[PDB]
Scaffold this active site. Structure first.
Site, PDB file in Angstrom:
ATOM      1  N   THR A 257       0.820  -1.206   0.000  1.00 56.64           N
ATOM      2  CA  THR A 257       0.000   0.000   0.000  1.00 56.64           C
ATOM      3  C   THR A 257       0.859   1.263   0.000  1.00 56.64           C
ATOM      4  O   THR A 257       1.861   1.347   0.713  1.00 56.64           O
ATOM      5  CB  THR A 257      -0.965   0.018   1.205  1.00 56.64           C
ATOM      6  OG1 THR A 257      -1.889  -1.073   1.094  1.00 56.64           O
ATOM      7  CG2 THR A 257      -1.743   1.324   1.264  1.00 56.64           C
ATOM      8  N   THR A 258       0.475   2.232  -0.825  1.00 55.70           N
ATOM      9  CA  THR A 258       1.069   3.558  -0.774  1.00 55.70           C
ATOM     10  C   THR A 258      -0.039   4.605  -0.824  1.00 55.70           C
ATOM     11  O   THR A 258      -0.774   4.695  -1.808  1.00 55.70           O
ATOM     12  CB  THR A 258       2.053   3.801  -1.928  1.00 55.70           C
ATOM     13  OG1 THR A 258       2.884   2.649  -2.109  1.00 55.70           O
ATOM     14  CG2 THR A 258       2.925   5.012  -1.626  1.00 55.70           C
TER      15      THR A 258
ATOM     16  N   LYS B 283      -8.885   2.624  -1.917  1.00 53.77           N
ATOM     17  CA  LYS B 283      -8.318   2.960  -0.612  1.00 53.77           C
ATOM     18  C   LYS B 283      -8.617   4.398  -0.200  1.00 53.77           C
ATOM     19  O   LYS B 283      -8.199   4.848   0.867  1.00 53.77           O
ATOM     20  CB  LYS B 283      -6.810   2.706  -0.597  1.00 53.77           C
ATOM     21  CG  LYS B 283      -6.420   1.263  -0.877  1.00 53.77           C
ATOM     22  CD  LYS B 283      -4.909   1.073  -0.835  1.00 53.77           C
ATOM     23  CE  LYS B 283      -4.527  -0.339  -1.256  1.00 53.77           C
ATOM     24  NZ  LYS B 283      -3.052  -0.538  -1.319  1.00 53.77           N
TER      25      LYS B 283
ATOM     26  N   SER C  95       3.435   0.708   3.135  1.00 61.44           N
ATOM     27  CA  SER C  95       4.708   0.041   2.892  1.00 61.44           C
ATOM     28  C   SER C  95       5.569   0.769   1.862  1.00 61.44           C
ATOM     29  O   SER C  95       6.778   0.911   2.043  1.00 61.44           O
ATOM     30  CB  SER C  95       4.457  -1.392   2.428  1.00 61.44           C
ATOM     31  OG  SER C  95       3.685  -1.407   1.241  1.00 61.44           O
TER      32      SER C  95
ATOM     33  N   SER D  63       4.307  -4.754  -2.414  1.00 58.25           N
ATOM     34  CA  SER D  63       2.988  -4.699  -1.788  1.00 58.25           C
ATOM     35  C   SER D  63       2.166  -3.537  -2.340  1.00 58.25           C
ATOM     36  O   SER D  63       1.043  -3.290  -1.898  1.00 58.25           O
ATOM     37  CB  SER D  63       3.106  -4.588  -0.269  1.00 58.25           C
ATOM     38  OG  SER D  63       3.618  -5.781   0.291  1.00 58.25           O
TER      39      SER D  63
END
Lengths: 234, 204, 238, 202, 245, 220, 233, 244
Positions: free
Chosen positions: D1-2, D33, D130, D169
């Protein structure tokens, strides 16, 4: 007309407490005398039948080896307070390794004063006051002490005190004969005398009970013979 | 394992208008046998039996609480219980202990008390029901029982053949398991009667 | 008579009779007076005896090193409140390591005593208090009623026949702020004295004194420790 | 995830990747998200999907009731405070990194970070997840006070592209959303729309 | 307007004409109380209280009927005092909890709504009695403005430009409606408050009294404060002199 | 276990295999993994079997109560919310992995629900030990706005991929087709798997089993 | 703050009567009438859904409510109480279904609901329900018709009436109705016994009807009720 | 019977000898103590609320005097009766709506909201410890398929949907008026509905109101967000009535 148990009279008193005070006036009369040689407690047994074993009548009990208690009124209610007092003394001994002062025990029992009520309480809480008057007689560092307690929770130290049906008369008689230098013998003698005056039956060895607490001797309940030796000197 | 602590085996088998349920008779604690007459099959009404294998305590306990609820059922309602309903009842009872389960894997075998249609099923230790049209097994010799049942079971069998089949399956499966056996008992139930037999078995 | 028996019942005229009846319990108690200088706070209380062979009722109780009280009414409620105050003071010393401000203790008493004047089957506290204290804002005398109301007093008196004391105190207010301890206790004793017929007067047997101040922790004097205070008073004659 | 949020004058800009993994397997290659908390308040989620979804729902509920009871557009700081309360009280039971951002008539465009501990801080720009680790430098050397809305858009787009390129990720598609008094403008950058960078050859 | 046949012993009981008399009686307890007024202008809110002195033995500032509910919210009460204090504690706790949960100072209208719901909660059951007090809440902010609300024993909450409670309610209101407070400043207002108090006071029935005064506005940066001894005595003088006409 | 779900033009196709294993032994060859939620909503279940059973039954019950009260047909969002909140409350200790699909007033909706309480709304989803094979089939041969038979073919293909490539899966294929005005609970779709015919007759004849004890009990 | 009265509001009179229950029954015998007929192949419930204005939207609230897929309810007495009992009955049915995975028998539902009704005649601080219930059901092939009263007692009926003029409706039923009737004929005589009281023009929106055969319980459409109210069909 | 009483049947919510609940009826009477009247009318494409706005004092912030409340962005209500009770019930309604959306993922229908509130009130009707609320709630909103919706709930626990209703003093008369004006069968349009409600209230109390003496809530199909009309638009509706 039914009102709450925690209702005030327009005079500023709790009906239940006052009615309990009234309930004491039917109790067996009791006499306590404080003296630098010890404290004495005497009470009539009020046997209502020759078939009743009088030794099963104890209106004087040992709270501890240095504190006795004489009770008047509803004895059944008194048993609870007596047990609570004993437990209290034993807890104090356990925690501090020293005996309770008579005033401290008296105060402890007095803490259960107005601990009654309906709403906003535990399901095992008292519904009404204790209908009983108590006389604590003990010996501690402040010497021989005698305290009196009523259903109001108010407890006070007394030199000579009478509770029960013939309270007023006996108290007057006590006033006429008490001075802060009597012997224990004079105290016991006086007590038995006034008791005989107020008792409706003839005073004898199996008709009253008498107990002393002296600085050199633990709580002692007088035996039949020990009573006879005193009643002899009427 | 906990299930292997006492061992044991329970099997049920469908027939024509009949049904069969069997169990070994051994009660032991690990390697040591204590008794050879341990009951693992319990009547839950006429033509409806339940088989319980696994931890002996939970066998007895589940049986007892089941009889409790069942008796209450048969009192509130004016009828004997239907097999599906008994299965759902047991399932509920077991799932109530989802996070502290009884260690038993029950097997139900019976005929519809209104009709006569045979019914069999088995459940998890947490009560996941499973109905089949052939057979169900539970116990420490599950693989063995599967092996026998897959090779011996025919569809429309008559009482005698159902008996011979379930008996041979139980005997030969149990005889390859150290903690199962010391005798076998078979209840074959049909519309009119119930036959209960104890098989001639090895005692080792 | 139908608005008499429950604290949760307003009268048609905007009053609560149980609270007032409770207030009447204060007047049944022996009189007590409290006054302050600019350095000291003094409670003086007329004890009281059942019979001559009984000691005189305690009227002054110790709460914390800087706070003491004088009671008037039901003694059980008095001891209840006393234990509450003691516990609050202990809590304050435990958590903050500084003595609990008197006004806040009083506020807490108000909060606690207000509660049962609004709940069914509950009763008001049948006791009035005079609170003597000393903190960062000097000496303090407070008064608490069964109505759960409280007052910051310059001086006060409550109990039977306390109106006289109230009058006397009301006369000599302007003197108090500059009096010395002996004179302050004197004034308190005179205020207490005016609450008696000409036949009876103060003794070392029926008077309790309580003092707290900038140079003195809260202390209780009675019996022979009262004598230095009394033996210094003008034999006020009828 | 960013996840990423940049504050500008008229409001804010939100960006996130779309990869949700369970191990090395991608359970969802197209995750949303960016989650609306109110009409003009969004949150960026990172960490446990269950945790962040649950918390976001709870906050949406609370903030809705709150805004109705006040009859006013809710403050961004209020939504952020709600997230902060939940994430701090249950810090030992939640794995959530949140970025609350939005517009508010009282304080304008704002961005708050609520990392795993449960602390809350307002920032000019915020990054999380991450992948964020790989773009701290870039975002530090590229940021500039007084960016326009489109500049912030391109900015977050670039940063997220870089992170997604480096982090396993992270990946999939880019989701952007601009928030201002005007309203909410959501868009999606996919495939070739995603900014590319010259890869080393010889 | 006076039915008392058991229909007025509980707040859980309607009268046959659709009334709850316990609440009305509590209101009546408010009516028998000394008068307190509050007025809102263009840069804040001002409070005034006629605090009747029952004894010269009581200190100056005893039995305050002005409260700090929050650092930005002040409270003026009338009626049964202990009840008023309890409600003040409730208001304080509500404001505190709001700050802890949301991060900023509680909006006045919301605090009002909350405390008023709490008050209303006591007008439904036989187990408890309605609050024998009415109260006013005042506040000022640059983001909300100046606000003044009032709450009665029934739980009703309204926003006001000027309001009064106690004995001389209507008289005070008549005196208030003469003011153009939407244009005046708190400074100018204090004098008028003190004035209206001195007018409305009945020196015959009620003996001596003490005047309480409270600021909350732009002059105080939003902090509810007590009126300085200076401005207070100024306003009092203005009042006494305005009383001779 | 291999379960899948897809969204087509007129609604939703759900698919499941029918093998139930205890360890590495097949217990059930014909397990039903497609559960009734509401007349318009169905749910495939993988994970802990008892947990999926009870979860799905509980939600079905609560939804029946809900629709009974509302007088309307349940929404898929409702099922999703109930499931995910219940599951989150139990912190993954309820091992229910679900494919939830249905048709609403707002149209067709497909969610995947994980035991921890996270959900995903997607046009196609897979769960279970055989989920990666099925997902491969989808990612290779899925297009938006498919027709009914095409969608059924795709889903059955994915379930088959799972069946033949996963040891946890096997036996038959169940489909459930849900459209704006039709419900095709095909069970089973097509059994691509068969036990080989018995070469022998291992039939035991009466008397071959020795008996120690008999007891006949007549009934009624 | 609140707690609760813990004493009974329903007590024995010296005559031996539970007065509040009988007053509740008085409340029932003052409500709109309802009829129930068990008819071999089905059960009919019907009631007077007479509004008080044309403003009332009769397509919003119903008196004939489904409990499950095979059980239905009507009432006579107070509406809100009935609504409570309906929710409760539905809940009970679903609990039963969760435990047994089998649709609840009508008699069992009746018993459980009746138990709930009995609670409110003995538990503290409450009055009994002012409602009599008619419960129809299809279970085990047979059809079922029960009635439960505020005391918590229940009775199985072949046919009955409750509410206003329930005595005359009952007699009318005793004469002009008996067994071996198809559900259609039963609906007919049901609307017929309701018509023995329905003061005014009995339209398709003045009454509500529900049926219960072995295909499930359902409320009749206003159209179907019109066709029946054509004194024919 | 016919008005007989026994025990405490006039003090708490227990049955009278003829099976009535006196306290509930007293609550209905308690509604009128406010001295106000509210009108609610359902259109073909909308729903309208109107209520008297009696502000007898200039010392009030009119802005705070309202009987119109937002329950949800798309659900509006009008309260009639005891004020505090009304606000309590409003809070409860808001909570039930928010909770509904939180649990079920979709917006609550007016039907179910009203049913919920009524269900709650029934408890007050059946338990002795508390007395019913002296208020009456009328909800308006647009449903997804049934169109516009007007519902209403009682202190008795009754609730129902209406084409038109009213509450307060002029209730029966308003009902008579509205039920007379519904039978006509006219194009129930936005303006037709607003005008119908306003004129109902006006004729029933006879006023030809100022735009500051009433308040109008509204909800439309094209604009489902509950909107409270400004005094300006209200007046715009007023002057249009003095033309025909």
């Amino acid at each position: 007309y039914d009102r709450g148990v925690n209702t005030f009279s327009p005079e500023g008193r709790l009906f239940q407490v006052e009615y309990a005070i009234e309930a004491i006036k039917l109790g067996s009369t009791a006499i306590g005398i404080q003296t630098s040689e010890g404290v004495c407690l005497a009470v009539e047994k009020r046997i209502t039948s020759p078939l009743m074993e009088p030794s099963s009548i104890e209106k004087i009990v040992e709270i501890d080896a240095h504190i006795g208690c004489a009770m008047s009124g509803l004895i059944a209610d008194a048993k609870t307070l007596i047990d609570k007092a004993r437990v209290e003394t034993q807890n104090h001994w356990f925690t501090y390794n020293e005996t309770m002062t008579v005033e401290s025990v008296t105060q402890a029992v007095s803490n259960l004063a107005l601990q009654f009520g309906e709403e906003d309480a535990d399901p095992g809480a008292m519904s009404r006051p204790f209908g009983v008057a108590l006389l604590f007689g003990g010996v501690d560092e402040k010497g021989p002490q005698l305290f009196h307690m009523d259903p109001s929770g108010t407890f006070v130290q007394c030199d000579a005190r009478a509770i029960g049906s013939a309270s007023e008369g006996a108290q007057s008689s006590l006033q006429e004969v008490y001075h802060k230098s009597m012997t224990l013998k004079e105290a016991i003698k006086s007590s038995l005398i006034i008791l005989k005056q107020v008792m409706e039956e003839k005073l004898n060895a199996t008709n009253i009970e008498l107990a002393t607490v002296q600085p050199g001797q633990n709580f002692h309940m007088f035996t039949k013979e020990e009573l006879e030796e005193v009643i002899k000197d009427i | 394992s906990i299930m292997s602590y006492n061992g044991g085996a329970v099997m049920a088998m469908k027939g024509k208008n009949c049904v069969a349920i069997a169990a070994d008779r051994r009660f032991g604690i690990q390697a040591q046998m204590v008794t050879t007459d341990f009951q693992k099959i319990f009547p839950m009404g006429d033509r409806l039996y339940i088989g319980l294998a696994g931890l002996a305590t939970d066998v007895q306990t589940v049986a007892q609480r089941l009889k409790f609820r069942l008796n209450l059922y048969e009192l509130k309602e004016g009828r004997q219980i239907k097999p599906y309903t008994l299965m759902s009842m047991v399932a509920n009872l077991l799932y109530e202990k989802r996070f502290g389960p009884y260690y038993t894997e029950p097997v139900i075998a019976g005929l519809d008390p209104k009709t006569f249609k045979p019914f069999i099923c088995s459940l998890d230790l947490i009560g996941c029901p499973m109905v089949t049209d052939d057979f169900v097994v539970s116990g420490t010799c599950a693989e063995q029982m599967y092996g026998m049942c897959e090779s011996l079971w025919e569809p429309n069998m008559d009482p005698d053949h159902l008996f011979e089949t379930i008996s041979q399956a139980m005997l030969n499966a149990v005889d390859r398991d150290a903690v199962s056996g010391m005798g076998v008992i078979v209840h074959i139930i049909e519309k009119d009667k119930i036959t209960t037999r104890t098989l001639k078995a090895r005692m080792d | 008579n139908q608005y008499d028996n429950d604290v949760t019942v307003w009268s048609p005229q905007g009053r609560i009779h149980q609270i007032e009846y409770a207030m009447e319990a204060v007047k049944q108690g022996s009189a007590t007076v409290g006054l302050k200088s600019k350095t000291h706070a003094v409670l003086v209380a007329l004890k009281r005896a059942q019979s001559e062979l009984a000691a005189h009722q305690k009227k002054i109780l110790h709460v914390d090193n800087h706070i003491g009280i004088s009671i008037a009414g039901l003694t059980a409620d008095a001891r209840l409140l006393c234990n509450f105050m003691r516990q609050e003071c202990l809590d304050s010393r435990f958590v903050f390591d500084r003595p609990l401000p008197v006004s806040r203790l009083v506020s807490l008493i108000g909060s606690k005593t207000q509660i049962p004047t609004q709940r069914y089957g509950r009763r008001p506290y049948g006791v009035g208090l005079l609170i003597a204290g000393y903190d960062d804002m000097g000496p303090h005398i407070f008064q608490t009623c069964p109505s759960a109301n409280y007052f910051d007093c310059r001086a006060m008196s409550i109990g039977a026949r306390s109106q006289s004391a109230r009058t006397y105190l009301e006369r000599h207010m302007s003197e108090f702020m500059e009096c010395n301890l002996n004179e302050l206790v004197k004034h308190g004793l005179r205020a207490l004295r005016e609450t008696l017929p000409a036949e009876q007067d103060l003794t070392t047997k029926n008077v309790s004194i309580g003092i707290v101040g900038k140079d003195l922790e809260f202390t209780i004097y009675d019996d022979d420790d009262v004598s230095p205070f009394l033996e210094g008073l003008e034999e006020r004659p009828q | 995830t960013t996840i990423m949020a940049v504050q500008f004058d008229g409001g804010v800009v939100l960006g996130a990747d779309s990869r949700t993994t369970t191990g090395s397997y991608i359970a969802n290659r197209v995750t949303d998200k960016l989650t609306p908390i109110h009409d003009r308040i969004f949150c960026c989620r990172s960490g446990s999907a269950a945790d962040t979804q649950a918390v976001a729902d709870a906050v949406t509920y609370q903030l809705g009731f709150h805004s109705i009871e006040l009859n006013e557009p809710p403050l961004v700081h209020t939504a952020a405070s709600l997230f902060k309360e939940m994430c701090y009280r249950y810090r030992e039971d939640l794995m959530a990194g949140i970025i609350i951002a939005g517009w508010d008539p009282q304080e304008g465009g704002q961005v708050y970070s609520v990392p795993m501990g449960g602390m809350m801080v307002r920032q000019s720009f915020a990054i999380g997840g991450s992948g964020s680790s790989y773009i701290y430098g870039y975002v530090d050397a590229t940021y500039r006070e007084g960016m326009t809305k489109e500049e912030c858009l391109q900015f977050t787009a670039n940063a997220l592209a870089l992170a997604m390129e480096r982090d396993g990720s992270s990946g999939g598609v880019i989701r952007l959303a601009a928030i201002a008094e005007s309203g909410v403008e959501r868009q999606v950058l996919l495939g070739d729309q995603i900014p590319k960078f010259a890869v080393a050859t010889l | 307007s006076s039915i008392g046949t058991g229909y007025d012993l509980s707040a859980s009981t309607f009268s046959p004409d659709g009334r709850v008399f316990q609440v009305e009686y509590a209101m009546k307890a408010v009516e028998n109380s000394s008068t307190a007024i509050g007025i809102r202008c263009k840069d804040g809110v001002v409070f005034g209280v006629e605090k009747l002195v029952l004894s010269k033995l009581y200190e100056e500032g005893s039995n305050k009927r002005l409260f700090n509910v929050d650092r930005h919210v002040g409270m003026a009460v009338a009626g049964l005092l202990a009840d008023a204090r309890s409600l003040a504690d409730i208001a304080r706790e509500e404001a505190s909890n709001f700050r802890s949960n949301f991060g900023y100072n509680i909006p006045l209208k919301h605090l009002a709504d909350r405390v008023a719901m709490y008050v209303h909660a006591y007008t439904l059951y036989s187990a408890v009695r309605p609050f024998g007090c009415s109260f006013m809440l005042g506040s000022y902010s640059v983001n909300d403005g100046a606000q003044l609300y009032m709450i009665d024993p029934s739980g009703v909450s309204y926003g006001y430009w000027g309001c009064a409670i106690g004995k001389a309610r209507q008289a005070a209101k008549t005196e208030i409606e003469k003011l153009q407070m939407k244009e005046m400043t708190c400074r100018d207002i204090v004098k008028e408050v003190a004035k209206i108090i001195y007018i409305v006071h009945d020196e015959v029935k009620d003996k001596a009294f003490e005047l309480e005064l409270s600021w909350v506005g732009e002059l105080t940066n939003g902090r509810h404060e007590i009126v300085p001894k200076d401005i207070r005595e100024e306003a009092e003088k203005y009042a006494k002199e305005s009383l001779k006409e | 276990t291999t379960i899948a779900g897809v969204v087509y033009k007129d609604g939703i196709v759900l698919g499941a295999d029918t093998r139930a294993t205890e360890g590495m032994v097949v217990a059930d060859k014909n397990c039903s993994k497609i559960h009734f939620i509401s007349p318009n909503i169905y749910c495939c279940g993988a994970g802990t079997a008892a947990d999926t059973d009870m979860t799905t039954q509980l939600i079905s019950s609560n939804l029946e109560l809900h629709s009974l009260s509302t007088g309307r047909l349940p929404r898929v969002v409702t099922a999703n919310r109930m499931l995910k909140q219940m599951l989150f409350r139990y912190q993954g200790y309820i091992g229910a992995a679900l494919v939830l699909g249905g048709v609403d007033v707002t149209g067709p909706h497909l969610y995947s629900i994980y035991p921890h309480g996270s959900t995903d709304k997607l046009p196609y989803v897979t769960m279970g030990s055989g989920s990666l094979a099925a997902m491969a089939v989808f990612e290779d041969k899925f297009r938006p706005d498919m027709e009914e038979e095409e969608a059924k073919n795709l889903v059955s293909e994915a379930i088959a991929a799972g069946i033949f490539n996963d040891l946890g899966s096997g036996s038959n294929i169940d489909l459930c087709v849900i459209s704006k005005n039709k419900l095709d609970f095909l069970r089973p779709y097509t059994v691509p798997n068969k036990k080989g015919t018995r070469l022998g007759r291992y039939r035991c004849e009466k008397g071959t089993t020795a008996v120690l004890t008999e007891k006949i009990t007549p009934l009624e | 703050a609140e707690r609760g009265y813990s004493f009974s509001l329903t007590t024995f009179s010296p005559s031996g009567k539970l007065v509040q229950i009988e007053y509740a029954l008085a409340a029932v015998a003052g409500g709109a009438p309802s009829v129930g007929i068990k008819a071999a192949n089905g059960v009919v419930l019907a009631t007077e859904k007479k509004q008080k204005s044309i403003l009332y939207d009769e397509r919003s609230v119903h008196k004939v409510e489904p409990i499950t897929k095979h059980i239905g309810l009507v009432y006579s007495g107070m509406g809100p109480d009935y609504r409570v009992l309906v929710h409760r009955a539905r809940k009970l049915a679903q609990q039963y279904y969760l435990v047994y995975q089998e649709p609840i028998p009508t008699a069992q539902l009746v018993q459980r609901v009746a138990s709930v009704m009995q609670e409110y005649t003995q538990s503290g601080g409450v009055r009994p329900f002012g409602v009599s219930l008619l419960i129809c059901g299809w279970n085990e092939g047979r059809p079922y018709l029960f009635q439960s009263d505020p005391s918590g007692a229940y009775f199985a009926w072949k046919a009955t009436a409750m509410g206003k003029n329930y005595v005359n409706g009952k007699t009318f039923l005793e004469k002009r109705y008996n067994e071996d009737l198809e559900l259609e004929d039963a609906i007919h005589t049901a609307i017929l016994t309701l018509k023995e009281s329905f003061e005014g023009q009995m339209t398709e929106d003045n009454i509500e009807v529900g049926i219960c055969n072995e295909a499930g319980f359902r409320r009749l459409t206003p159209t179907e009720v019109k066709d029946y109210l054509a004194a024919i069909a | 019977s016919r008005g007989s009483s026994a025990g405490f049947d006039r003090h708490i919510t227990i049955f009278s000898p003829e099976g009535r609940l006196y306290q509930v009826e007293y609550a209905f009477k308690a509604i009128n103590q406010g001295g106000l009247t509210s009108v609610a009318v359902r259109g073909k494409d909308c729903a309208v609320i109107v209520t008297q706005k009696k502000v007898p004092d200039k010392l009030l912030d009119s802005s705070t005097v309202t009987h119109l409340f937002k329950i949800t962005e798309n659900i509006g209500c009008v309260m009639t009766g005891m004020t505090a009770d009304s606000r309590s019930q409003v809070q409860r309604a808001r909570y039930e709506a928010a909770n509904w959306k939180y649990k079920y993922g979709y917006e609550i229908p007016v039907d179910m909201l009203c049913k919920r509130i009524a269900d709650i009130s029934q408890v007050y009707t059946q338990n002795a410890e508390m007395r019913p609320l002296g208020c009456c709630m009328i909800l308006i909103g647009i449903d997804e398929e049934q169109g516009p919706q007007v519902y209403k709930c009682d202190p008795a626990g009754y609730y129902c949907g209406f084409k038109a209703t009213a509450a307060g003093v002029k209730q029966t008369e308003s009902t008579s008026f509205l039920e007379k004006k519904v039978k006509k069968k006219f194009d129930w349009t936005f303006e037709q509905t607003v005008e119908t409600a306003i004129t109902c209230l006006s004729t029933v109390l006879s006023i030809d109101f100022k735009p500051s003496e009433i308040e109008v809530g509204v909800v439309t199909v094209e604009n489902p967000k509950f909107r409270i009309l400004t005094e300006a638009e209200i007046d715009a509706h007023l002057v249009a009535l003095a033309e025909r």
